RNA sequence: UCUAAGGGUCGGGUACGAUCAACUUAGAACUGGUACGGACAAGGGGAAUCUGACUGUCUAAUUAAAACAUAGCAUUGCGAUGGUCAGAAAGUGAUGUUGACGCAAU
RNA sequence: CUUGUGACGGCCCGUGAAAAUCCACAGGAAGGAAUAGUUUUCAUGCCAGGUCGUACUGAUAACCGCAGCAGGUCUCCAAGG
RNA sequence: GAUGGGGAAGCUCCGUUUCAAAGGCCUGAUUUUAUGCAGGCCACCAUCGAAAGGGAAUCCGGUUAAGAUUCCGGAACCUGGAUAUGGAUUCUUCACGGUAACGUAACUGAAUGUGGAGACGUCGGCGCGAGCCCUGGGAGGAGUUAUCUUUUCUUCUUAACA
């Protein structure tokens, strides 16, 4: 039935002045200092989250390694791998339907 | 069932033991 | 970070070579 | 009628190779015991050759034309077949189904496949399929 | 069982604000919270996020569209007359 | 730093950066309910701690004997 | 002092049994100086009239109201070189990151 | 019970900050090996981290109300019946 | 809230990107050498403004008459800079594996562009976690004992970081 204390001078419980209760290996109870959670990296396209990328504050993603941060795909830790199959569609078919569509202007003005 | 593990355990201390060492 | 990062790795590197040209 | 033929570029659209163009040399259209689905044997490029102007003499040149391969097992659903062809007889018989799972035999067909892509690539053969699909 | 006679969703604002203009609050918030066909998808996914935009839940596509309701009958005469002189232009 | 392998250990224990090595017995009952000693040694380096865990008193005193002489033991 | 109902987890060739743990409700006897939400805690109600629709606001230190506000209704001005308002002046401002389903004044 | 969090649902003519900062992707400039290199987003190893505050009260006696004034003054923790 | 400007007899007023010739950034090239000349890139455009907003990184035990996340002992982490060794990669120069979602100790990437994080209301119910509360057995200590009570109270703990 132990109370705790605030462990800084802020006495106000914003954001960033979030506590937990431990119990010390001394066996009382302290509050313990928690930082903000994490969210997780989105797409850029769909704007779900990114499904392998690690999940940390933006300062933190400078000590990881390159593998915590990527995929090993195109537009790894970028976009979705359903965004970047439909962009990889998009772009075949619309290339595709480019040349015909120039083949075809250019056969109608030959002709006529 | 640890004779096993002795015997590599041996093995191991061997090869890092090298106080003997050959001048020629 | 990355700007500062890669003008430490060029200057590592700079250092390197400058060593070894001798 | 079917066009899932064994001459036959495609583009991959899933996996560590997607949007790479690869060309059919072996169908399998009722699977294996190891692969229970529709799939291919293909051979592809993992990094295309660089754009080849007057200003390079040679050494760039040289440089700049090379072209590292792959072979992939890949399902159906994971190709985008063309309509375009390439001919395959210099390597139809070094990729096959025994080559795989030993990393030997990928290596040494990498090689020969690296090889025929650098002829056709340096005749003037195929340049839809060593250009890049830019996506 | 149909707990209220007439009321219905008006039933939260008790015995304030006048009969008559719970009435038009009713038909209004009827249209504002009903849910509408998707034209893209083809389902009954869209619902309105804001005063004018209606976004459906499956295809994740989001239409502007009137206040109230996801199509008003001033834009749906608009949208044809449009139509309409875009087929004269040529003509 | 646990460390799982005696190897990994011995070669730590090379290092120059390491000179001190710290011995503990820890007193056990196994499944049958019979005591044993359990030896752990600690090992510390400029950047980090390593641990080594050894739940047998005769394969311990080879590991003790096996140290470089450059490195000493000390019991807790 | 009892009764009844309300569960979990394991068990079945190719209907149930075992174990474990909850406070919720209903009912029945019996009993007492008819007491029992036993202290604490805890709505007085009805029939009408005047007035303001309601929630809300104000005269800090004599007035909390029927006063003010309010949604609703209606009127007026204005299409930007503009309406309303500011500034001693300005190559100056507010509405205005605005445009009549708006801004401004009643 | 207190608190943190997740997936949801209701509400709006209200849909509920910005910047520093950090990371990734696209691109292919340039540099590059064979008797040798290229890499320090992998591991280990080396050095340094300046300035100012830091006691105590925070209220029927440490603040403001002429004062050791029943007044006023923001907030965290919260046992059993 | 300066500057460029424009008002004001003037103390000063307006305005904050404006009717401005508004600057700095990396590679280097040269190794009379200093840092100009080779280059190339970029156009925000002062600054102030939060001890409750955003934000790199520390915990436990002990210690004083009076200090402690600050001292002592132990155990960590971050930033900036130096740097060598091992590992990785390469004669197919800049990795392999999995159908795939993706995985790993690593596994070049300038200019330029794009994306993400920072970065977000309130209420309601439901799920999960932590701490507390309740409670059983056991190992210790204390209390009551005319009678009764295998009883009443108390200790049985585990931080950051990996
Ligand atoms: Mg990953
Ligand atoms: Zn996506
Ligand atoms: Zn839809």
Known sequence: AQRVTFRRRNPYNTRSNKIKVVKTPGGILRAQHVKKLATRPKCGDCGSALQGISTLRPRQYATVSKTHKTVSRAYGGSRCANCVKERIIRAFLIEEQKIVKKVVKEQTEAAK | DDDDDDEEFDKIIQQFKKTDILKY | MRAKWRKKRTRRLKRKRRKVRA | ?135 | AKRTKKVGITGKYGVRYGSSLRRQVKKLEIQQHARYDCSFCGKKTVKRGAAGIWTCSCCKKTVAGGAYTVSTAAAATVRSTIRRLREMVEA | REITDIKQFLELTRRADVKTATVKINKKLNKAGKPFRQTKFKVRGSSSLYTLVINDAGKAKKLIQSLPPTLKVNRL
Do not use: C, M
């Open chain 4, 1 to 135: 009628a079917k066009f899932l033929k064994a001459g036959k570029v495609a583009v991959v659209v899933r996996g560590r190779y997607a949007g790479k163009k690869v060309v059919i040399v072996k169908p399998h259209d009722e699977g294996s015991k190891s692969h229970p689905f529709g799939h291919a044997l293909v051979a592809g490029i993992e990094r295309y050759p660089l754009k080849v102007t007057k200003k390079h003499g040679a050494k760039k040149v040289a440089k700049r034309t090379k072209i590292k391969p792959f072979i992939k097992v890949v399902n159906y659903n994971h190709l985008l077949p063309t309509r375009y062809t390439l001919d395959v007889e210099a390597f139809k018989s070094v990729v096959s189904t025994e080559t795989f799972e030993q990393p030997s035999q990928r290596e040494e067909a990498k090689k020969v496949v690296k090889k025929a892509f650098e002829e056709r690539h340096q005749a003037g053969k195929n340049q839809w399929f060593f250009s890049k699909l830019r996506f």
